[PDB]
Design a protein around this ligand. Structure first.
Ligand SMILES: O=C(O)CCN1CCc2c([nH]c3ccccc23)[C@H]1c1ccc(Cl)cc1
Ligand SMILES: O=C(O)CCN1CCc2c([nH]c3ccccc23)[C@H]1c1ccc(Cl)cc1
Lengths: 229, 222
């Protein structure tokens, strides 16, 4: 059978998001080349993951591609900062690609982006971000980042409301007071503004020096239909 | 301060609505929009000094936060004022510009479209004045808080207090517990889009003006 997104309980939402989680990939081996190769491989898995975020396949294909084109670098970044949280001062791009600030100095313009990513990872560490919170934030990014550069918009907002309910549930079951739930919610959501900022400055840097286009993402999203179950 | 005193302090500190210099070309429009921005900036400083918690920061921290947030602050203002003018941006009472007028300036129309989509979002949520001021203060305290080079708990403490406040206004207005977190989230997710617009606006302004760190410091110090 199939669950419609708005019917899911918080436990079904959490389970759906955990089961959709992509794998941790390895670097295949210049720093930019490694980071580009890794991003390209991550993107394949990201398509598979997006298709499994409750609500996403309710949208038309052209709206799917809108959302993913807006969000893909933020998505890459949040998963990076997540994985990096237990390595203070380092970015765990892969288990065999743990880079420090000084290594970021090898590409002109890169240290400023490395520094921002690091500040984010350290902020998640200090908040003790949990895996089940992470997955909710990541799915938020996907449905939100492109929501305002477009009845159907209502649906995405209702899905977003379900994810917020889900984060609140997690926080209430972890023993936070109603007031602490609201504060922690707000703190996590304001970090999302910083992720957007990092993605904007990242895009500018990539364009200053090939990035996933609209057309590429469209094709990838479409091609997913042909993959073996 | 109580949630109610926070709200009164913020409303009290609001800046004044300004007029644009008393049909439009591109040089004329950019100049109008630049001059209005420059004039808003001195009032923005006075507003920033009365956001509770902000004067307790060191001068350098004040400047960093303002430098990071200034454009999002103007933009949120603008979007707020434009709420009731669907398809138009109310830069001033005597400067109400539509999409098409945007197209006078190469690159501008995209930023215009995004600002209109925000205004139209705020309209559909029925954003209230008391919520607006809380959001604007959140931007000032949050935008630059993760981009410091190296106290920051102080800013986080204030940010938490605006959250409480946002909730209390919702509770006052009779939202259920569930509705309160859902609204909170909806409002704070819009701040991502404000941030994005500020980034895109910075790039667009760099294709041509922008207040320096040192100028901000002077103005805040004086
Ligand atoms: O240049 C910048 O300022 C942004 C750099 N990006 C930082 C985030 C990021 C990159 N590769 C990744 C692989 C996995 C996770 C996160 C990343 C890299 C990256 C490199 C190339 C491409 Cl096409 C996409 C992302
Ligand atoms: O070109 C862009 O993408 C950004 C354009 N900005 C949009 C928001 C904005 C401008 N002037 C304003 C005056 C009041 C409120 C909002 C604004 C204008 C602007 C013009 C000059 C300067 Cl220095 C700053 C802001």
């Amino acid at each position: 059978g199939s669950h419609m997104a708005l019917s899911l309980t918080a436990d079904q939402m959490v389970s759906a998001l955990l089961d959709a989680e992509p794998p941790i990939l390895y670097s295949e081996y210049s720093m930019m080349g490694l980071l580009t190769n890794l991003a390209d491989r991550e993107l394949v898995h990201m398509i598979n993951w997006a298709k499994r975020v409750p609500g996403f396949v309710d949208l038309t294909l052209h709206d799917q591609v809108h959302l993913l084109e807006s969000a893909w670098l933020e998505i890459l970044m949040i998963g990076l900062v997540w994985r990096s949280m237990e390595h203070p001062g380092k970015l765990l791009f892969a288990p065999n690609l743990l880079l420090d600030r000084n290594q970021g100095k090898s590409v002109e313009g890169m240290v400023e982006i490395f520094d921002m990513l690091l500040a984010t990872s350290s902020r998640f560490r200090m908040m003790n971000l949990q895996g089940e919170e992470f997955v909710c934030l990541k799915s938020i990014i996907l449905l939100n980042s492109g929501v305002y550069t477009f009845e159907e918009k209502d649906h995405i907002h209702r899905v977003l409301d379900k994810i917020t309910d889900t984060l609140i549930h997690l926080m209430a079951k972890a023993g936070l007071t109603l007031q602490q739930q609201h504060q922690r919610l707000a703190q996590l959501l304001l970090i999302l503004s910083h992720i957007r900022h990092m993605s904007n400055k990242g895009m500018e840097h990539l364009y200053s020096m090939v990035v996933p286009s609209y057309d590429l993402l469209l094709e990838m999203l479409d091609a997913h239909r042909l993959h073996a179950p």
